[PDB]
Write a protein that binds this DNA or RNA. Structure first.
Ligand SMILES: [Mg+2]
Ligand SMILES: [Mg+2]
Ligand SMILES: [Mg+2]
Ligand SMILES: [Mg+2]
Ligand SMILES: [Mg+2]
Ligand SMILES: [Mg+2]
Ligand SMILES: [Mg+2]
Ligand SMILES: [Mg+2]
Ligand SMILES: [Mg+2]
Ligand SMILES: [Mg+2]
Ligand SMILES: [Mg+2]
Ligand SMILES: [Mg+2]
Ligand SMILES: [Mg+2]
Ligand SMILES: [Mg+2]
Ligand SMILES: [Mg+2]
Ligand SMILES: [Mg+2]
Ligand SMILES: [Mg+2]
Ligand SMILES: [Mg+2]
Ligand SMILES: [Zn+2]
Lengths: 97, 214, 127, 25, 63
RNA sequence: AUUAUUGCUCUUCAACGAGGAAUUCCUAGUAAGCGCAAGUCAUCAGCUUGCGUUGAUUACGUCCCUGCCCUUUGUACACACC
RNA sequence: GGUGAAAUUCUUGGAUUUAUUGAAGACUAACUACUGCGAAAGCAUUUGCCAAGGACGUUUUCAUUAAUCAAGAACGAAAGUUAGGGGAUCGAAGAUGAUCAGAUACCGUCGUAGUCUUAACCAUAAACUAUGCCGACUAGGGAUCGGGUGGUGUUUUUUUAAUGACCCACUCGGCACCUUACGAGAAAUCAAAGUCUUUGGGUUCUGGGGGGAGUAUGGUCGCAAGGCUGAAACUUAAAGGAAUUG
């Protein structure tokens, strides 16, 4: 029986929202019910902090990172990314990190 | 068997007047033969780069601009305006959750009869001391703000062609008179003209085209 | 200080391109994609496929004209994956390391006022 | 069998008897 | 052939799938006052002097 | 005692030049080299069970493989995934 | 290119990649959220026009005009049907390349219908909150959305103010999260699933073991595919729910 009272995800009063298409497995899932991260990530990377501003003009430069929002599909979300699978109490903690 | 580099006519680019440096980058034609000549075959091409790459200071880290090349005068070729962009890493920086967003737009003309399309953007600034984590907009506050944005955006152009609008936003005088009337409705942060694009140009007119040269 | 071009890297999955052209785009300068400097289909995109790319052009970049150049990195983007094909990183670091002069680059790949529904369909591509 | 196909089974069936009864009208 | 001596400042961890690489901070006697972290292939205790065969570099985790 | 129980002597004088894909055993008087006693035994140890002799290089780690645990989870199995 | 690895497949026709502009149809990213609205299905670019509406404000007006509803009626996602208009995109059939012992599939490819839109249909969804509607009462907490009250409150100057957003007390009406358990219950949980053997505010509807079966039949609807209504014979000891330990 009900093993969730926010149901699938977050949908009380609206009654219909639109499919966001999971980026890895290409499913359709209700925008709300998505599960979403933000891809804040410095365009260059780890080892490259040196090799950059060194063989580069300007002073230090500034460094201009890139953002993309990733919508996952459960079926996807489970597999790789943020999901784990929780016990019957921690399935409560909506809290982030 | 060819390797065209033992054949390619070679140029540098020249910018115009309402900025900083005029001399630019480098390029590749082909020998100015009879039939398939290096003059009227190309040149017209366009080139983009951020404007701190021609305003020198990094109090201008984004704002890209396409320059249309127009004229030629012996292995040199000038350019004139063809639209301004921005940068993702700032757009995306500035397009941030827990807040509203506004953008309006206008089509219009100028003294020299280029018609173009300009845009804008600004964001609900969380005003210092606001307990509430969202600083929200009231629609009726957005539409009137679109209106005002529209009030200003169509009295700023038709002022002496591109050149005068050009030099009307390089220091973003607009960005504040926007923010001027704006303080009377709500907060707001960022407040930038984002993009702008040309599409219906008049004739070459090669006498008032050469204005920004020397 | 130096003479410019446009570096522009289009790193995708199961290949990585690298090619510079003229700042007005319209005129190239040397390409070499990953899929060449290695042969094994799947192997078409790995780290080194990139450092092996920017070796047979950054040279020729430093051999026809360009001594410097700004990059415009790109993902397959679109209605597709829109997230950085690994072999662009290992290409840039391999033209920052080419001695080649770097400066001022942004994200150019396509991101749209979403539409034209993705392939594979509503149940998704499932395995 | 799956509710949907078992429903569908009994609807294809349903349609054949129409057919076999038409023959008689 | 410019070498580099390194004074194990302390024992950190064991990195790398296997688990024989040993994480460690090494100071340099030939002008101290600065720290450098490196990995190793042997069993290591505090005050093992080490041979950095390049002056400027320091890795992180091993895979 | 032939199909040759074992043993001794002379003659005969193979393959095998350190072994591919692979897989075992093990951290100190241990590894591995070495033989002896004991079992079986009329006769027959290339076997095994214990014995001592000589006596090392390498770890004193981790989870990558591998096996197995333990916690969460799902379950429509409880003769319990044969 | 594509994939876990592949292949079918494009490439003297420079494929893939780059640059300038052009066209078509769909769609509305980011801001987009335990937030808004509509009786629901449902609804996110701009401004215009059209009429619509909740809450509030209200010493304004009528005065029982009301609550719930057999029949009947308006609406109704997706698909599906008729006639055009369209037709990018994705893509039921169909064909294919791999896969397998088989593999009509899963993956890849090609692509008809379809997808949009006008006129007409159709009346189904786990159309979900699997929870009827009006009414009263029963318990704490900080949020938040619209309305309103209040201030020798803060932030904006110019000349205080007047605006505007803020801050807070309190207040109606919204979507909700929480803590509890007076109380409920088979339990999972529920502030309504509460005030129920200490059994009655009003009202509509549905169910009376599991099959047989939503079958047959009759009436009806719709072009149709189907909808509404809707049995019985025979059979049969479980089928079923929540939760406990394996
Ligand atoms: Mg369940
Ligand atoms: Mg799977
Ligand atoms: Mg007949
Ligand atoms: Mg013996
Ligand atoms: Mg034996
Ligand atoms: Mg938008
Ligand atoms: Mg009747
Ligand atoms: Mg079509
Ligand atoms: Mg088929
Ligand atoms: Mg086949
Ligand atoms: Mg088939
Ligand atoms: Mg629904
Ligand atoms: Mg539901
Ligand atoms: Mg309360
Ligand atoms: Mg209790
Ligand atoms: Mg029957
Ligand atoms: Mg259960
Ligand atoms: Mg259990
Ligand atoms: Zn998915």
């Amino acid at each position: 029986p009900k093993k969730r009272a926010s149901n699938g995800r977050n949908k009380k009063g609206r009654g219909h929202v639109k499919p966001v298409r999971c980026v890895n497995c290409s499913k359709s899932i209700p925008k709300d019910k998505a599960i979403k991260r933000m891809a804040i990530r410095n365009i260059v990377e780890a080892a490259a902090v040196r090799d950059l501003s060194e063989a580069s003009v300007y002073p230090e430069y500034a460094l201009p990172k890139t953002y993309n929002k990733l919508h996952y599909c459960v079926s996807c979300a489970i597999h790789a990314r943020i999901v784990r699978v929780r016990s019957r109490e921690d399935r409560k903690n909506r809290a982030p990190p | 068997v060819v390797d065209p580099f033992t054949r390619k006519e070679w140029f540098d680019i020249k910018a115009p007047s309402t900025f900083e440096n005029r001399n630019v980058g480098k390029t590749l034609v082909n020998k100015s033969t009879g039939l398939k000549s290096a003059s009227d075959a190309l040149k017209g091409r366009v080139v983009e780069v951020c404007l701190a790459d021609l305003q020198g200071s990094e109090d201008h880290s984004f704002r890209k601009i396409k320059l249309r090349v127009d004229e030629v005068q012996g292995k040199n070729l000038l350019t004139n305006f063809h639209g301004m962009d921005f940068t993702t890493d700032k757009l995306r920086s500035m397009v941030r959750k827990w807040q509203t967003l506004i953008e309006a737009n206008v089509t219009v003309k100028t003294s020299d009869d280029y018609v173009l399309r300009i845009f804008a953007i600004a964001f609900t600034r969380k005003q210092a001391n606001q307990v509430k984590r969202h600083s929200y907009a009231q629609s009726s506050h957005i539409r009137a703000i679109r209106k005002v944005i529209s009030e200003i955006l169509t009295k700023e152009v038709q002022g002496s062609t591109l050149a005068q609008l050009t030099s009307k936003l390089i220091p973003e005088v607009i960005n504040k008179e926007i923010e001027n009337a704006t303080k009377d409705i709500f907060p707001l942060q960022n407040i930038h003209v984002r993009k702008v694009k040309l599409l219906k140009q008049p004739k070459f007119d090669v006498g008032a085209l050469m204005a920004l040269h020397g | 200080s130096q003479v410019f071009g446009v570096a522009r890297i289009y790193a995708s999955f199961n290949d990585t391109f690298v090619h510079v052209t003229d700042l007005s785009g319209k005129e190239t300068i040397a390409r070499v994609t990953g899929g060449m400097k290695v042969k094994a289909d799947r192997d078409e995109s790995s780290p080194y496929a990139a450092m092996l790319a920017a070796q047979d052009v950054a040279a020729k970049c430093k051999e026809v004209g360009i001594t410097a150049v700004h990059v415009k990195i790109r993902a397959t983007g679109g209605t597709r994956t829109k997230t950085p094909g690994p072999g662009g990183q290992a290409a840039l670091r391999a033209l920052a390391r080419s001695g080649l002069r770097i400066g001022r680059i942004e994200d150019v790949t396509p991101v749209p006022s979403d539409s034209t529904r993705k392939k594979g369909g509503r149940r998704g591509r499932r395995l | 069998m799956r509710a949907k196909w078992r429903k569908k089974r009994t609807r294809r069936l349903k349609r054949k008897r129409r057919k076999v009864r038409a023959r008689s009208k | 052939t410019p070498v580099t001596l390194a004074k194990v400042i302390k024992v950190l961890g064991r990195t790398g799938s296997r688990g024989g690489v040993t994480q460690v901070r090494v100071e340099f006697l030939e002008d101290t006052s600065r720290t450098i972290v490196r990995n190793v292939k042997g069993p290591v205790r505090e005050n093992d002097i080490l041979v950095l065969m390049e002056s400027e570099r320091e890795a992180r985790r091993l895979r």
